[PDB]
Design a protein around this nucleic acid. Structure first.
Ligand code: MG
Ligand code: MG
Ligand code: ZN
Ligand code: ZN
Ligand code: ZN
Ligand code: ZN
Lengths: 162, 162
DNA sequence: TTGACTCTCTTAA
DNA sequence: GAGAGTCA
DNA sequence: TTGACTCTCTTAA
DNA sequence: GAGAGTCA
């Protein structure tokens, strides 16, 4: 809600609840042929999810608290960042999973960045393969690699140059 | 419906029309601190665009030809790839700009690949900065770089480990 | 047969 | 990646 | 007050 | 990144 104290109370109650979610170990590519280990705190697959949590989409949840007799509600991964600017360079800030695991609510696996920065981590070579993200990736992006391009650049005639 | 010869004729008429688009020289980052040059064949900003071309969205166009009294229409960048498979790994193939310039219709700046592969080129370090795309990028992706993350991973208490 | 508009849709963050 | 409404 | 559902929306390829 | 309709 409005005051700084109330926002801190929201963050603390969220952390305490998420801190009781099952801790699931995931071994992940780091880039550079190296592997690491992440510990994701995973929201349950089905209700009940935890105090204050409800599922609004297949992989979307919201956190809800009653403050000053009014219901306040946030996207479930946005709560750690409630004291941060909600935009950057005129772009909305989004919760962004460094572990690329939407059920995870570990705030040590989340950052707060534009949707473009968020998306781009999907292709990052990873912290041991050349990640240049200022807020460093925890793993190589799941979509990193050569791709599966069906056809490359080509012309039939002689009208074009690169 | 349309024979291989008729499809080749469509591709040829498309190339002949696009080849007359204004050719714009762009200096571009290649990665590795190097600069290169791309020559984009840019569809006009407003009608008329060229024989067979019409705008269906702010940065969307279609190519239309009528053959044996039947109207055929294609996305304007898909025409070079009409003799190629249209899906791969269960994913639809998309026209993908290697120059990241949607108005460009130079077929030497296009490839044909999944939407994920397409998107990922936005963050590629480029052909001189570590591109691993099997069909190599022509330039560093426009969104490559350290990003502008507002807040990184953090917790207030001690409930979490990474 | 053609141009210049109109509309809505897909994907996965 | 989001916000908000309907019920119990 | 809290839980468990429902719906549609944003972005930029 | 897409497909399709209307009108003259
Ligand atoms: Mg993400
Ligand atoms: Mg693209
Ligand atoms: Zn995680
Ligand atoms: Zn990274
Ligand atoms: Zn181009
Ligand atoms: Zn590349």
């Amino acid at each position: 809600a409005l005051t700084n104290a109330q926002i801190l109370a929201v963050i603390d109650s969220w952390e305490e609840t998420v801190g009781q979610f099952p801790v699931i170990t995931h071994h992940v590519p780091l880039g550079g042929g190296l592997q690491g280990t992440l510990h994701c705190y995973e929201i349950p697959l089905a209700a009940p999810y935890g105090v204050g949590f409800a599922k609004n989409g297949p992989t979307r949840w919201q956190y809800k608290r009653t403050i000053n007799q009014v219901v306040h509600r946030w996207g479930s991964h946005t709560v750690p960042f409630l004291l941060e600017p909600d935009n950057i360079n005129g772009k909305t800030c989004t919760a962004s999973h460094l572990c690329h695991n939407t059920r995870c609510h570990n705030p040590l696996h989340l950052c707060w960045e534009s949707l473009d920065d968020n998306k781009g981590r999907n292709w990052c070579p990873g912290p041991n393969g050349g990640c240049v993200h200022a807020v460093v990736c925890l793993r190589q992006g799941p979509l990193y690699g050569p791709g599966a391009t069906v056809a490359g650049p080509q012309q039939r005639g002689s009208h074009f140059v690169v």
